[PDB]
């Protein structure tokens, strides 16, 4: 029920002259906006990406962000001229700002900055501040940024008021896609394990939405505790993929099943039995010469 809204900025500076800034916006695991360096305007990746804001209210925010993009670029190049030669090109700056929606009329905002891959600065209260363990040569650039009372005032406004106000409406406009249910599809395969005389059983689960899922190898009522749950891998159509593997001794596969529990299945779990007729036919349809197989 808790949704985190994230504005991610990626800025690359190769030398004094060359630079590019690309941004993406997320509401939970759904991309809502895109702003390529090449593009003059913020793009909607959803039909409800404008939220409850008006075309007038939206253009006011878009102009502010257009001015910011231009300014940020020149301001980074200047703060580099201040740190010279303690910091030099190429420079990578990342920025993550947003708010996460809590139950009731409650929400906390954040603005984190990472420099050359490492988290270094945040906006907290009314100022920019370095994080503990941040390098000493960042104190003077943070002092010059804190001198700019105008930027500080608008950042406070965006974090305290604008972000929650906008996201409350964004949840309204996008409710149909956030609570969208896509059913998973599971299939089986096996590879040799790293250990001699062992096999690794693979249960593939793809195309489910939302992300929470339960995948377990079973033997009747007994959950195999060797089940290794893989990471969530994304699909191109906003669904998820997950693998769950199980190391077994060659010949122990018969009796094993892969159970999948998901909200979209309405209590009707997917139970995939290893040596069943469905599996045999599925396995015969995905045979190959094994050329360039991994090292399993």
């Amino acid at each position, epitope marked *: 029920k808790n949704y985190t809204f994230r504005c991610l900025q990626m800025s690359s500076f190769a030398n004094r002259s060359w630079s590019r800034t690309d941004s993406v916006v997320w509401l939970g695991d759904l991309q809502t906006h895109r702003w390529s360096n090449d593009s003059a305007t913020i793009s909607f990746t959803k039909p409800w990406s404008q939220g409850k804001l008006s075309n007038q209210q939206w253009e006011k925010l878009q102009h502010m962000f257009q*001015v910011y993009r231009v300014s940020f670029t020149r301001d980074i190049q*200047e703060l580099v*001229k201040m740190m010279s030669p303690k910091e030099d090109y190429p420079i990578e700056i990342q920025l993550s700002a947003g708010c996460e929606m809590y139950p009731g009329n409650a929400s906390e905002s954040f603005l984190h900055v990472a420099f050359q891959g490492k988290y270094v600065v945040r906006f907290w209260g009314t100022s920019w501040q370095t994080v503990p363990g941040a390098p000493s040569w960042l104190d003077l650039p943070i002092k010059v940024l*804190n*001198a*700019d*009372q*105008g930027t500080s005032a608008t950042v406070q406004m965006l974090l305290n008021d604008t972000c929650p106000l906008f996201v409350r409406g964004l949840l309204e406009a996008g409710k149909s896609d956030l609570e969208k249910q896509e059913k998973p599809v599971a299939w089986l395969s096996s590879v040799p394990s790293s250990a001699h005389g062992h096999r690794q059983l693979v249960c593939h689960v793809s195309g489910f939405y939302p992300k929470p899922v339960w995948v377990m190898w079973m033997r009747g009522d007994q959950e195999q505790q060797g089940t290794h749950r893989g990471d969530f891998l994304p699909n191109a159509d906003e669904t998820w993929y997950l693998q769950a593997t199980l190391d077994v001794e060659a010949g122990e596969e018969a009796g094993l099943a892969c159970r999948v529990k998901h909200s979209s299945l309405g209590g009707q779990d997917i139970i995939l039995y290893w040596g069943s007729l469905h599996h045999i036919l599925d396995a015969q349809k995905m045979v190959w010469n094994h050329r360039h197989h991994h090292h399993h």
Partner: T-cell receptor
Amino acid sequence: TQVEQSPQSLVVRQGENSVLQCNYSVTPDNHLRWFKQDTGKGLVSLTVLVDQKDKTSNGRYSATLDKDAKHSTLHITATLLDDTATYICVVGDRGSALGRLHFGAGTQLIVIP
Amino acid sequence: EAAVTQSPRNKVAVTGGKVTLSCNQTNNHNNMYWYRQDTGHGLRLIHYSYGAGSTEKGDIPDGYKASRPSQENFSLILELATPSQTSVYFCASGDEGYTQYFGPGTRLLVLE
């Protein structure tokens, strides 16, 4: 040229009022400052305007700023002879030392007794 | 009150000559700036500095070199003086804030 000052020259009779204009296209425009440059001397700050629609005073000097029209007006009431100088409009593009100053060419004011 | 001094107040040089314009500031201001004033133009930024050892090019750096040996001093060097460098030179200093404090000016006439 991103900071244009009007008129280029202005002759006023002693004790009379003066109106100096500044139009600019600088983006972003954090603040606008007015300077007095006595002939052969340096720049002395008369006033600074920072708000979207701002107004400021300093004795006989008074100034307005409209950030939507990108326009500032400087008023000198009961002009004395010592007011003969060049008045320069400066626009700051940041609220810190990361900014650049954009200078107008000035308005030459001649106070005649 | 914040103040900046410049030397010499007036200078005469010949084409191909070498001129050094100096700026002194004791406000403990990290940032220092060099401008030229010409008729029909506003002050134009030549070079600037963010601290001792630092020198950054401005908008019109061609024909000028700069040196910030210490916090208090900033110099403008013209290794090869040309008559187009005939101008009034202004030096300024500042802290992390947006105000610059201007020096009194140096008049430079470059002759054939």
